[PDB]
Point group: D2
């Protein structure tokens, strides 16, 4: 146990009384609205989102990085830190690794995971930066690089990622690359894409029967003129070309200004190519901010699309949900804890939507009541539900408060040497 059980216990008790009042008040209110709060809590307590191994360390920009105390020394420290997130929120049972950063004996990763009660989610390849000994630089691209040998080196790396995942329990490989151009003319848009498709078809051949290959679009950064996998359109073209095992990943902050992201999710779902969602928030570009911190309503509107799919009865729909954020000015663990919470919060509120009444207002083109029906769920403070979900599953009524009372950060700060 990363966090002393007696600490969690003391902290949960101190708030039990206040929780009981708010929850029961919310229960009565929901009952008046025809909603059984227990059924909502039952679903919330089982909603999981993956945590990125690389999100537990302090992030930075190209201008600087301001690390905090007790920064994780390697993958094992990161897993230890992810264990804290899961223990307190019970919403992040799985960890998503990034190779080569997390490269290590699979036997040992698995054992650490099992020992911590953590599982492993989608693997993540890295051909957007050069590693030591690398025979070919990824400066001008990787999977779509004009140099065949360079593309072969990227393919092999993705295949290795799969092998590693096969040994630890992972069932998918996420592929995000920087490939693109910074100057008009530097790249032949069409040929660069074909090279990419060619390299991806090879990675696809290495997929086990029950694995999936996720391609992730991004409007820009690191490329500032054009990007091979720039949007969901090109993303869909990829998944449809590769095969049943290939699907699209939608990362919130990877879209052009004012883009209607919730629609893209719907479109993808409609054609069964929504492989998963990468949560975070933003205001300007791919800011990778804590989910819900900037536009909480948009987060709820993304989930509205997710829940409506289930309501419509879409078949074999098990999206892979992962958090992909950067924490440049907060305790990484704390931001992940509250981000995971916002996600559960948006999900919970989406469950509160009266689809029946909604279905009616849409039919009569009653735009105002349709929107109001959505707002009634969104405006509901579901915090009590989230808190109760944690209590029942061994988590903390107030995760961050409990995290701070345990003095965890100071503990690891004294154990881990800064570099």
């Amino acid at each position: 146990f990363r966090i002393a059980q007696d600490v969690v216990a003391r902290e949960n008790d101190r708030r039990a009384s206040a929780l009981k009042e708010d929850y029961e008040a919310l229960g009565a209110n929901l009952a008046r609205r025809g909603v059984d709060i227990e059924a909502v809590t039952a679903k919330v307590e089982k909603f999981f989102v993956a945590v990125p191994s690389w999100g537990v360390g302090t992030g930075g920009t190209r201008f600087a990085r301001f690390p905090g105390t007790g920064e994780p020394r390697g993958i094992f420290d990161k897993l230890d830190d992810c264990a804290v997130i899961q223990q307190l929120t019970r919403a992040t049972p799985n960890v998503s690794l990034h190779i080569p950063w997390d490269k290590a004996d699979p036997k040992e990763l698995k054992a650490r995971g099992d020992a911590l009660g953590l599982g492993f989610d989608a693997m993540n390849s890295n051909t957007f930066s050069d590693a030591p000994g690398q025979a070919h630089s990824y400066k001008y691209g990787s999977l779509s690089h004009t140099n065949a040998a360079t593309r072969a080196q990227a393919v092999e790396h993705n295949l290795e990622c799969i092998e590693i995942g096969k040994a630890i329990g992972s069932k998918a490989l996420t592929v995000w690359i920087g490939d693109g151009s910074n100057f008009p003319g530097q790249s032949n848009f069409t040929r660069a894409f074909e090279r990419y498709l060619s390299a991806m078809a090879e990675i696809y051949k290495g997929l086990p029967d029950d694995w999936k290959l996720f391609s992730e679009h991004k409007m820009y950064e690191p490329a500032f003129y054009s990007t091979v996998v720039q949007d969901w359109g090109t993303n869909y073209l990829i998944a449809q070309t590769l095969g049943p095992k290939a699907q699209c990943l939608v990362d919130l902050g990877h879209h052009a200004p004012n883009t209607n992201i919730e629609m893209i999710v719907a479109r993808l779902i409609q054609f069964g190519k929504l492989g998963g969602f990468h949560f975070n928030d933003s205001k300007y570009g791919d800011d990778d901010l804590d989910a819900g911190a900037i536009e909480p309503y948009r987060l709820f509107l993304v989930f509205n699309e997710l829940v409506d799919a289930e309501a419509r009865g879409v078949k074999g729909f098990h999206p892979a949900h992962m958090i992909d954020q950067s924490h440049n000015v907060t305790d990484p663990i704390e931001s992940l804890i509250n981000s995971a919470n916002e996600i559960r919060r948006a999900y919970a509120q989406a469950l509160l939507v009266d689809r029946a009444a909604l279905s009616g207002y849409q039919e009569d083109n009653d735009a105002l009541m349709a929107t109001e029906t959505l707002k009634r769920a969104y405006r509901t403070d579901v915090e009590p539900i989230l808190a109760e979900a944690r209590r029942r599953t061994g988590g903390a009524v107030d995760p961050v408060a409990t995290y701070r009372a345990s003095g965890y950060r100071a503990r690891v700060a004294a154990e881990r040497p800064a570099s």
Copy 2:
């Protein structure tokens, strides 16, 4: 007189009275546990007012088309009768903003009708973005900044007339928003056009009463699609500072570039005593003029957070003029203004809930997480019970839109007005 039968208001309130009591008392207990007297909040909420635009009472359209609904108001007097409903039910819109020449009519009567309907008059709005019957000089290439002196003078005189009308009805401010700008590079000399504008505004200011305010309103684009004289708050500040003490800036939420941090702009203007007021509405792409809070409710709360904080910091003489400037193209105008007016009170109430002492503490300790969390604990709070109670205690409706539909008002005026 009452546009909506008082027996309907009473009935539709008694039908919801029980539930409201339950919700209000629960919220009251919850705030008490948070050191907040719910009565202090309600008291301030029922005191918050925002003016309604006479032109918003009718159905709006785009350059592509206009799809009017039944019972469209024939003129200013019909529009006042519908504004009376908005006010009667929400009790948050005691004043109406007139637009000239659209609502030009015997001021003496307007006043009479206003007092009869329990309405007052807010800022006057001038119109030099369109030509009027008989007008001698077209505003096609501008108005106040037009290159032709005779044209600028005509625009000036029109604004002075606007002040004359407004003085007769009890108005205390003139709002100037023009489309002046260019659609082609080189079409206008930026500096000279602005100098022409300043000179004209100076003349209008000259004829402004000493108990009146002159509000200039910036906008990035439309109808001008390359450049706009008063394109942003920076230029707007220059205008206000230049003109004088009685001149201030008006911030319209949808008149800003993509991803602009509007709350910041609001704070800056307050700091330099130039925040004259607001034009509330929501948007996702451009100046969509959608119902407030329909797209980004958190942003609305943040704008209000700055207003409430300005008071907490001891800023003096701060009395912003709040106005709704929206276009309702696919809903009953009256129902939209009702809920928009409501969303604005909602954002105000949640902002009043912020624990400034605590927030201040986390800002000083650079505890970004708890700082944002402190803001969220207010925003997540469902303040609908306070809004409904406020309305109930002041002659309004627990559920405005519900009461509006139950009254059959729309069908009524549809039978009284042409098709």
Copy 3:
């Protein structure tokens, strides 16, 4: 029949010839030193055409106001007389794109007038983004994707009629742009609306002749302000791939989110054989519909770089249905369309000056600098002489707008057409 007197054209041409010969020869010498035969370029520029929107010759406005000029066309016939001017002076707009119901008239008359004016007819444009007098079902909440069956059916019926009118006048394609969408979250169900849109389009598709094409057009917003059924090229692609071989995509320059790489979209649609055509104009903030190349000439160039590159290589069946789609709110519509068309030919001609072999080499060497410099060398070249000589050789004007003004055509029709009032 000549809308603009031949003597005036001849007069205004002879007045600039001396200067043109100098500039043309100087450029040719330069191009020659660059291993380029100027005559080969002029020959292709002469053959490049872009359709003119019948509604483009009338003064446009915004939701705030409309300030009409003098001599506004009363209907399709006046509009055709105005387009004839554009074609006579620029020689780059031989075909007009009609819009129903606005241009609803006897197909026999339309054709006769076009023939007499030396104009052909391009893609038909349907209208379900506004209600017509005597229309049974409003399009307020949608048309092809509307929740009410009768309303969709009515929309379907209308598009089929446009195909009929088109077959009679010589058209070979139907362009579909609708405002269908929502202004509020919840108002629409993204999936069910789209499904309805697909079903309806599948019907219109059945009424397409064997040599006709159906073009769907995406737009991020306006008139819908929260979500649009056909919001981007992604959805558009799904539409075209679902409908069939005769269904392609139209890319309207200003119908994209801020900072979108539009030229890549072109390339993407080309790569998958779904680039129905391009709708030119320029913009800075949104769907501004400004004169092409007036704001970002280089982007226009880059878009053509993709068009020419695709053309350069094995042109599968590549024959995009290009059309200008602009709104002229502060200029004489004819002069804007005249210069917009010239601008389009400018980007095209410069795209033809690109050293493809050299570009290909730098691309494979990942020589980003030289790659973008190779492109700039073409773009920087001032091709006005080629454009000017092209018009002259084909009975066009060396200085289109100058000739237009010198002819007095505007004052003329202004004297022949009823006055218009400004929209308040």
Copy 4:
């Protein structure tokens, strides 16, 4: 000379022939337009833009940095490289320094500068990162940080920048900071700005009589929610508040999407607060790409505003221009050479605008001809002018070609050690 003279001469002779042709042909066409090409060329060869000392190294992103061969390390390697740019384009006689990156003995800086034929431009302070052994961290800000000792440290540092500047010939201090917040509520907009203004006031006091203090706005990055100096509005309020010696810097890529940047330049000039413009290009955000490589017409429209002012010599308008770019996929030197070229190209084209005619069209509201009057100058290929200007002033006809012919890059790669190769 970083580049041998025989190489420059040889590469110019090889292109002299065709240049005479193009130049003469352009001189004729301009003559027919009432424009004397010599007047234009004389002004172009005098148009300079400061080069950033950090612009010669390979740039990177938060995801990666892929250095090329012969990477300059330290202000001395850097100055050696900047000299290449100056010798070949003759458009960048001065270099802008960044402290602590280029911190070195002033005497040695002045020495190397005079030897390479380079002067020094505005000083650039750095409080958007922590230096080794720094008492207070700038994680949560610097000049507007909530902690007093932190602001004091930031102020003191900037003053240090002024001192270093007074000893090498610099006459200005540019101040761009990352200060802002990433979460609503994290910072109090007004109090953060007040602390900033109060700190800038202290720096301002340390300015000599002939020195200028430039503030630089930026919409976002590294702050992803709010930035204290987010736009020119706040910037103007800063310059106005600090005094006569304080002006605003406009960095092309530091604006919200679709912003009309040329208008901002005009407004600032009309009010005497435009301290200078930092050149680069962008398509998405602050991409810091090569000037005019994405939107050359926009670059021209900005210069159209600068040239209009330069013609009527506006009071308080003596801009300090500098290139501020990041080269991630090209040879920094080649990219800087060409960016400086694009900057001049735009300048030259703006100088071709018939101001009288334009003015007339604006008065009559003839938008078509007005925009066409700008296009005529813009559509003019002025490469012949820029090339002759370089040739007359000791530069190279084709800068990048000459540079490549000199094998300079390979040369410095042999002298400088790479991290691993």
